[model samples]
Target: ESARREVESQAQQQLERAKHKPVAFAVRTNVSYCGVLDEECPVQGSGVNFEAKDFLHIKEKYSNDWWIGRLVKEGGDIAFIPSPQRLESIRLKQEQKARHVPPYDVVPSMRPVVLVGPSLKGYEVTDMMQKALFDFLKHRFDGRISITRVTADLSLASIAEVQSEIERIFELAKSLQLVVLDADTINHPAQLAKTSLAPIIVFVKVSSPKVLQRLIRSRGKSQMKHLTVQMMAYDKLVQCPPESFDVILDENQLDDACEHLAEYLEVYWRATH
Candidate 1:
């Protein structure tokens, strides 16, 4: 309860600060404005030509950063305003119409929850890699980014129980931009894809039979033989479908694989956004 309130309070504070922040004009090359498609735009009657050099002041609007104040023309006694995308988005929200309900509130960028797994042996490496990625994202955006690891019991729990726990974590971390989910294994990727409010990307770390045996032995466990047997059995049972995972990561070069995954997440989220 306290955590939920904290997340909401933090989000409210960020919004408040954004409200007071100065509006910016992004420079774009070659643009044309035809108002609202059918109707004649007040700012541009038929069409107007603008250059990349042109600077237009953009003010952030309520609801989301993408919906901005009326687009004002750059450098003129009179300001010309023409906005199509914002109008469409606003209309959609007004009608409460959306194909999918995203986990986080509407924002300029889409925050994602990455699901990584298949092997408990990979968890340590995944944890380190995700932490590095989280640090990069938090520093890049200068905002809170959280990673939630569902315990073994919860990961293997009933669908309803697992779903409830995920919901609670999201609620607690609503203010964060990127929420990384580091679970040992996701037993129900298909169900998760359908129900999760946030976008989910799965990455499976693969190890050859030899590599697996080597890894188990390198851990210095006194019962390496038994451990290997159990490890292989678990892997066989929890093998992820090839079509389901977004990336198949090779565990040979752990560092390279980790970095690659981090970069992949960054690019994937940005492209989707």
Candidate 2:
């Protein structure tokens, strides 16, 4: 109870600070707008095109419509934007939603949870899901269910190590409810299953459009080279012969993914019980 409470409390603190700090707006493009030219002021005066989730500070000085601010990106060149009041309203609305995972009876649990992925580049997202899963477990079950997560890199260690590692994990947490084991360790779904007993296997499937849009919006050529590698890795994750996963996700968005994931645990708990 104390440990989980610490985690839960810390998460709450981060949320509070994020809400009050008032910078780096998260949003989507509602309409097309023009930008300022280089001649207007100099390098500082030039404006950039807006896309989903621009880093607009929403400068308080320009309290009226057509506000001015700098982008969160390194360039720092100030840009003109629409009404901050309205923008803030839409920003809050566009926020993702989640559910409290319901408690269950005699659950059918797959002992350890396995999350397959979109890419090595997407470890943060995997971690995001890990935390969200923990949050769900804490929300409904709280200290009732004890769980932990382990990470692996298939690109590095030998297969023997991970297979042996799983043995230690199950033994280490013999009495715990579930353990989240990610496929950053093993990209091969079919082979990955041989190591665990009744694992709750999850595949994090992502469409090309989702990755493409994010890349375009964020900019940078680095993500492109890594993108292909990840895509190849995702293909490797998917192309395996006779891959049957416990669940798959439209993982571009976390809220939708988390809600569906919450239920998987609910059924598994009752199912395994």
Candidate 3:
């Protein structure tokens, strides 16, 4: 009974959208249209959905009334758009933006290294620690720090592409002292180091598996669906030798750990300079 009411409510909402919002027609041909709703408009009728015959397959793959209406308002026809291609385009655009160096009087001479770790529970705490470390570094150096977080979700791009992005960031920001976040464990850290043009100074952060499971549930269904496999790989990585890292921080020790990390960065910078 509850599910039926929700379905009815949703249907009515969709109908209202089709009536009030701009409508798009699915054509029985391999053609794209660019026209407004009038006599010349290829697709017509409000609150209507259709599939192409003769296996034309111009049916809507994903549904969002407002989004579809907006697409129709801008361009008259709607069709299957590859999500991976679109995601890659956006990631490429971000890389281009990163390459654009900010104009400043002082070209930076210091290189600040980042500490990264394997996935464990309390991943949110890891994120919080990263931010705290960033703040500490920024203040400790009087605002001469940059932090870059790297991601590789198979839903969006391949590991190769993300590694490419990571390498590019190093080259683009070589003049500045930077702290980088290399999050995905899809490609091992050794593989990542081989791909990078810059030196790596990584320390693996870990938390309890149970804590991770609890936090993982906080993610939306879509995210969890894509990340489930990666999460398992991360858990294994977390179980590796702790001695591999110069410093292994517990989830609860973020503040003190970050303070030490900040001091280490300062000392490392001074020694190198």
Candidate 4:
């Protein structure tokens, strides 16, 4: 009970402070907005005049930033928005609508969360998993949590590019509490090395054992130790009779997890912010 009370009290204080903090935003890109018959789909003969230069320009704007890259075209609303300012405006509008800010009522803890995955870069699942998580957490916590996301298509050339991308994400989320990072995204040592600043808590959202097993099996041939390092560095991995850090975030009983994260974020921001 002492620990629980301490955790809760710390969370309360952090939440109170978060109410007065300025929000940091993340923008997700590359989502499928239309059907297979849509122009952007390679299968469709009506694809738009999207050039690599256009996208490269946009990517340059948010250098050292985290922008979403989905597999499909999400909509025409983002067609002309090749800049970050326009993107932030769109986000502010969405935030205002979703945020039920009562006048001087002190909005609860405000922090950012971003979920990234390659699976979300396309039409099949629409990478709905992360978005589902976002909507789920948002619905429950209201303005307490906000999402910034990205996806990886086949366009990225090398692991260095991916590492830089993750670093960019880390830079953009200076005000975030818990960063729900995909083990697959940060599955490289170089990438992890880029993220020197650790957030309050990092949630490794795992869908199933098969997913982890599959990656481990595949990376075996690749001879990469990124996953091994992640398990160790993040304190999720245990050796010598084996311990466990692979956590399953049960939203039903989230109080403990929430408080744990809130406390760390509070101390971190207080020192740095």
Give the distance in Å from residue 86's predicted Cα in candidate 4 to where it truly belongs.
41
Off by over 4 Å in 1: 1-115, 121-144, 152-164, 184-194, 197-199, 222-230, 233-239
Q: Write the per-residue lDDT of candidate 4 for residues 161-239, one digit (tens) a residue.
A: 6656556555544444434433333322233322322222234343443554454455455423445443343233212
- lDDT, candidate 2, 191-270, per-residue tens: 54333244566766666646643643354565554555655666776664433776777666767787787777776554
Q: Give the lowest summed-lDDT range of ten residues in model 3.
A: 101-110
lDDT of each: 0.45, 0.48, 0.41, 0.33
Tens-place lDDT digits, model 3, residues 107-144: 11222254554453234533554566666656666655
Q: Considering every candidate listed, which one attains the maximal lDDT?
A: 2
Order by lDDT, highest first: 2, 1, 3, 4
- Per-prediction backbone clash count: 0, 12, 3, 15
- Candidate 1: pairs in clash: none
Better of 2 and 4 by TM-score: 2
Worst 10 residues of 2 by lDDT: 99-108
Q: Which candidate number maximizes TM-score? A: 2
Q: Using Cα atoms with residue i matched to residue i, what is each candidate's TM-score against the true structure?
A: 0.45, 0.46, 0.41, 0.28
Runs off by more than 4 Å, candidate 4 = 1-146, 152-171, 174-184, 187-191, 194-236, 240-252
